[PDB]
Design a protein around this ligand. Structure first.
Ligand SMILES: *SC[C@H](NC(=O)CC[C@H](N)C(=O)O)C(=O)NCC(=O)O
Ligand SMILES: [Cl-]
Ligand SMILES: [Fe+3]
Length: 105
């Protein structure tokens, strides 16, 4: 029951870059917590990625939860599909699976 205009805005945003991070804050100042922690992990990978600050856009903050059926932030997207949040990204990192996922494999 999502409005088609919101569906479109969210599909566009999630494809804004190959690797796209929805977070509290931005690359210069991430909110203490899960958003800052995931930024640190992404940084250590050396991959190019972009961020979007869901604290400054409530429509996207609430919309993306419905769009991705995922209740929390941060949300990492790769090639337009949800990967997950910090817990998933850490698990991937632990298993040596994070880099392949960031390259779309
Ligand atoms: S994320 C909010 C801040 N907490 C921490 O960074 C805790 C880090 C410690 N290493 C830990 O407990 O694991 C925080 O409390 N900021 C100050 C405040 O008054 O909110
Ligand atoms: Cl997660
Ligand atoms: Fe948090």
């Amino acid at each position: 029951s999502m409005a088609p205009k919101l569906e479109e805005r969210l599909k566009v945003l999630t494809n804004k870059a190959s690797v796209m991070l929805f977070m509290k804050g931005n690359k210069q100042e991430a909110k203490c917590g899960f958003s800052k922690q995931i930024l640190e992990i992404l940084n250590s990978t050396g991959v190019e990625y972009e961020t979007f600050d869901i604290l400054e856009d409530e429509e996207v903050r609430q919309g993306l939860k419905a769009y991705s059926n995922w209740p929390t932030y941060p949300q990492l997207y790769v090639k337009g599909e949800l990967v997950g949040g910090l817990d998933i990204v850490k698990e991937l990192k632990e298993n040596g699976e994070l880099l392949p996922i960031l390259r779309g494999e």
